[PDB]
Structure 1
């Protein structure tokens, strides 16, 4: 469960948040495969509640109605087409599995679902699965409200309703089997792994019992014995009885401390400095690298809906964001996930975004297709951070330096640092309020390298900054604090 199952050489996954299956399929062939992306995390593919108040919020997809592959992203045919086309070009698909709960207990009964399936939260009836009152934790939960009230009580966190979401009785074989049926359906279609949503709200043992029922990956694409990649969504920032390490026996875990701390460092909050990143990784109290799924921001916390808090960097903070993502992609710690979002009318009131519920770009509820601009950017309000030169080129940087050790670290005791990856790559950052100009040891072979942040390597030439490495591996770097991107990155595949 710990291996991503990506093609050899591809080291990252991208979250194509709320994208339609047909658009992801095309993206796999026209950009992800050629650019070396390892895979795609897709939004929940199972039928969810259609919420009209507010109008089709993104979070409606985290309120299951059934396991039918029928959503605003598409139907089963479209989903299968996407998984097949992506796998055929060496790009994997990871499913956001919402298996801890069904929809909110107060949601109105009826057919307001993405596939028209009938459901009655009040009577705990979900005939399309089917689930009944016997399949929920109503009688197991000991809180007065029936919802989670205290995170200091590890039991209620798992047996009670997360903000009212009907909590499935994961200890029952029937429920475990229905969930396994859904996940095996996806694995047989070709999915390479899963993000287990709300894993903190599930007992480690229950998750294991479910994972024990899963199939090996489809043998038409994967070698015999391949196990689905499992990364559990556990928000553990410390100070709680439940720890992310409690889930290591099931697969990897999302390390939310990563983006929270990186954000505070790059923002220079509380006096934090980039020079402190020298021992980045386990030294900062993070989970072991081989159990970490890292990211700068996710679909939740990029809109103040998750951990990390206000320190989280997002596309809204483009300049600092690119630097944070660049550092993450260059550093060897963990398995990296890049975020791809959509723009929404952010409206802050008293420090809170009143429009943080807004769903994907749409026309009368129908998700807009992803249009590509002549400059390779996206239209229809899709941000497509993964297409930003500074991010895409760093995704490739990580591939090129895969396996190389963290070395040749340098820092000015403030916010100017640099480091290399063996003899395959080198990166320099200037996050201080003054310019940077110094000759550093890159550990790279002599030659002329193209900076992949300010430009690209095209036909034996660089479109941006050029770096000259001497016979001793030394090279001069100049970065103004006024530069569009205050960091430079060069690697073996950017050499002239």
Structure 2
């Protein structure tokens, strides 16, 4: 469960949020594989409700109608083509598995689904699966509204409807089998693992029963006995009866405290300062590193739809965001997930964004293709943070230093810190309102290194800042609080 099943040497996955299958296939071949990315988290590949009011929101994909691989991202043929091509180039595919529920109980019956499948939420009828009233938790939930009302009651959190979403009776073998059937179809197609959506809303034991029904990975691409990588979306910020540790037996869990705390520290909110990150990791009350799936922001909380709130850093806060992602990718804690989003017209009214529902770039509901500009950035409103030099290079930094211990820490008692990863990498940050100019012990072998944040190493030369490491392993670093990116990173492979 716990192993990503990524090709050796690749240490991160990227969430290509709302991308079309054909675009992801191309991205695997033209960018992801060459750049060392380990895999891609795709949006739900199963048929969902087509919601027109609001107009095709991103969240309509979290309201299943059937398990037919037919969505705005493409059909099954296109999906299989994507998995095959990505696998052939060593980039894994992780499917966002929405198995906790079906669509909203209030959704109108009809064929307003991404594949034309008929469904009647009112009568609990989903013939395309098929599911009926006996397959839901309506009779098991004890709240007056039928929805989840109190998170202090671990039971209703699991048996009731999350914001109205029809709750599947996961204790039933029939339902467990229909879900496993769907997941095995994908595993045999070639996917390497799954993001279990709303895992907090499922009993650890029900999830385990489903996983036990899963096949080993497709033997045409994976070694015998390979089990699917599982990461469970459990929002545990403490203070609730449900703990993410209860899910350790099924696989990894998303550590949402990670992004929220890194956000307040980097924003320097209420006394926080980077010097405190000296013992970042379990030392901050996070889950064990070998069970953690970490990230700075996710599709959910980058738009206020998840835990983290205001402290969360997103592409909107470019400068601080790159620094946050940089720290995450350099630090040994957890398995890292990189976000890749699209721009939407944020409309803040009384502190909140009224356009947080806006779906991906589209033409009359048809998702726009991801166009690559000559500078390698994306068009059609796709942000493509994974293509930002500072981020992409830190993705490589992680691959390069994989295995190396956290060493040579330094901090000025405020917001200027630095540390290395064995003798394969070193990173320095300046988040103070004054310049940083100091000679530090890097632990790297003497030589000239290209700073991978400001530039790239391009055949015996750096296009950006260069750092000179002496025989001592010492090197001078100068970072002005006015720098575009107030941090420097060098590693064994950016060595001239």
Pair in the same fold by TM > 0.5:
yes
Paired with 1:452 and 1:143, the residues of 2 have a C-alpha distance of 54
SS at match of 2:475: strand
**1:222 Cα deviation from its structure 2 partner:** 0.2
- How does 1:419-438 map onto structure 2 within 5 Å? 419-438=419-438
Q: Shift of residue 178 of structure 1?
A: 0.3
| 1:459 to partner: Cα distance | 1.1
- Where 1:320 maps in the other structure, the secondary structure is helix
- Tell me how far apart the structure 2 counterparts of residues 237 and 30 of structure 1 sit (CA, whole Å): 38
CA distance in 1, matches of 2:398, 2:182: 34
Distance 1:263 1:399 in 2: 24
| Cα deviation code 1:57-89 (max 9, x no counterpart) | 000000000000000000000000000000000
Per-residue CA distance 1:128-162 (angstroms, 9 max, x = gap)? 00000000001000111100000000000000000
Shift of the alpha carbon at 1:167?
0.1
Output one character per residue of 1:301-350: Cα deviation in whole Å (capped at 9) or x when no partner.
00001011100000000000000000000000000000000000000000
Q: CA separation in 1, counterparts of 2:152 and 2:343?
A: 36
Shift in Å, 1:94: 0.0
SS for the counterpart of 2:54 is: coil
**Runs of at least 4 residues off by over 4 Å:** none
**Residues 254-279 of structure 1: CA distance to partner in whole angstroms, max 9, x if unpaired?**
00000000000000001100000000
Question: Hey, what does 2:340 align to over in structure 1?
Answer: 340
In the alignment, the residues of structure 2 paired with residue 243 and residue 225 of structure 1 have an alpha-carbon distance, to the nearest angstrom, of 30
Per the alignment, residue 122 of structure 2 pairs with 122
Tell me, in whole angstroms, the C-alpha distance in 2 between the residues paired with 1:172 and 1:333.
37
Give the C-alpha shift of residue 206 in structure 1.
0.2
TM-score of the two chains, using structure 1 as the length reference: 1.00
2-side partners of 1:459 and 1:4: how far apart? 32
The residue matched to 2:188 in structure 1 has which SS?
helix
Question: What are the Cα deviations for residues 216-259 of structure 1, in whole angstroms up to 9, with x where unaligned?
Answer: 00000000000000000000000000000000000000000000
1:371 aligns with 371
1:287, 1:484 → 2: CA distance?
A: 33
Query: Could you tell me how far apart the structure 2 residues matched to 1:424 and 1:94 are?
Result: 29
User: What is the distance in 1 between the residues matched to 2:97 and 2:270?
Assistant: 37
Deviation at 1:392, TM superposition (A): 0.1
CA RMSD of aligned residues (A): 0.3
Q: Deviations over 1:391-429 (max 9, x none)?
A: 000000000000000000000000000000000000000
Unaligned 5+ segments in structure 1 are none
Residue 281 of structure 1, CA deviation: 0.3
- The alpha-carbon deviation at position 297 of structure 1 amounts to 0.1
Unaligned runs of 5+ in 2: none
Partner of 1:445: 445
Distance 1:409 1:363 in 2: 50
Q: Which residue is 2:248 aligned to?
A: 248
Q: Give the distance between the partners of 2:5 and 2:279, measured in 1 at CA.
A: 28
**3-state SS, counterpart of residue 122 of structure 1:** coil
State the secondary structure of the residue aligned to 1:317.
Answer: helix
- For residues 24-78 of structure 1, what are the alpha-carbon distances to aligned partners after superposition, in whole Å with 9 as ceiling and x for unaligned? 0000000000000000000000000000000000000000000000000000000
Distance 1:133 1:281 in 2: 45
Aligned counterpart, 1:132? 132
